[PDB]
Amino acid sequence: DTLPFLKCYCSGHCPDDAINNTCITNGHCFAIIEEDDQGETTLASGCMKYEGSDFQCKDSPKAQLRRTIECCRTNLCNQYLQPTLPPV
Amino acid sequence: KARCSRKALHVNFKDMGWDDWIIAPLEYEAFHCEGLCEFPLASHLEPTNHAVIQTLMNSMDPESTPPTCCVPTRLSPISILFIDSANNVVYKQYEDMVVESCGCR
């Protein structure tokens, strides 16, 4: 089911209209860690629209760059989120 | 990483060589949409399921599946007063003239 209202933290993925580094949505908040070329990693986070979220929130084991996304469904649930990479 | 978003695009009917036939306005802001559409596709990008699938596949093998594209997903009208009719004056509202939002499709 869709969520009338969900408030999430964002970083890297903030809408143009973000305030206090937060975004609104009807789907999920996410946090993602992804690994760069020299093996450097960034964490980023934002809001995910409901439609498409069952596909985006599960992760393809076959991504060309190792990464982990996590989704949750309560206000600000992604602040303080630390997914770690799949074990090498 | 500059991600899919609305950028400024100024239309000026004189530069277009259209000042001969458009009476008003002289110019408006139409905006345009440009930028990466990468995994993951955040909420304001409002992807279709297809855009999600294709993006995922492109994330898996970019040689084999190209990226989805940043494009207007919501627009608004502009009304233009012009001639062109063997010079009979005419008022017309044109839909989809100004980008209000961008997303990946």
Author numbering:
A (entry chain B): 31 to 118
B (entry chain A): 16 to 120
From the paper:
Whereas BMP-2 binds to both type I receptors—BMPR-IA and BMPR-IB—with similar affinities, GDF-5 exhibits a 12-fold higher affinity for BMPR-IB than for BMPR-IA. Mutation of Arg57 in GDF-5 to alanine abrogates type I receptor specificity completely, whereas the mutation of Arg57 to leucine leads to enhanced binding to BMPR-IA and attenuated type I receptor specificity.
Structural studies were performed by crystallizing the binary complex of GDF-5 R57A bound to BMPR-IA and determining its structure at high resolution. Analysis of the two binding interfaces formed by the homodimeric GDF-5 and the two BMPR-IA molecules yielded a total of 18 intermolecular hydrogen bonds (H-bonds), suggesting that polar bonds play a role in GDF-5 type I receptor recognition and binding. Upon binding of GDF-5 R57A to BMPR-IAEC, the backbone atoms of residues Phe97 to Val104 (finger 2) and Lys29 to Ile38 (ω-loop in finger 1) of GDF-5 R57A moved up by 5.5 Å towards BMPR-IA, although residues in the very tips of finger 2 shared no contact with BMPR-IA. In complex with GDF-5 R57A, the α-helix of BMPR-IA formed similarly as seen in the complex with BMP-2, consistent with the observation in the study of Klages et al. that small changes in the environment result in spontaneous α-helix formation. Although the structures of the ligands as well as of BMPR-IA were almost identical in the different complexes with varying binding partners, superposition of the complexes of GDF-5 R57A:BMPR-IA and BMP-2:BMPR-IA revealed that the orientation/position of the receptor ectodomain in its binding site differed between these complexes. From this comparison we determined that the membrane-distal part of the BMPR-IA molecules swiveled towards the N-terminal end of the GDF-5 R57A α-helix and further into the concave wrist epitope, whereas the membrane-proximal half of the receptor swung out of the binding site compared to the receptor orientation observed for the BMP-2:BMPR-IA complex.
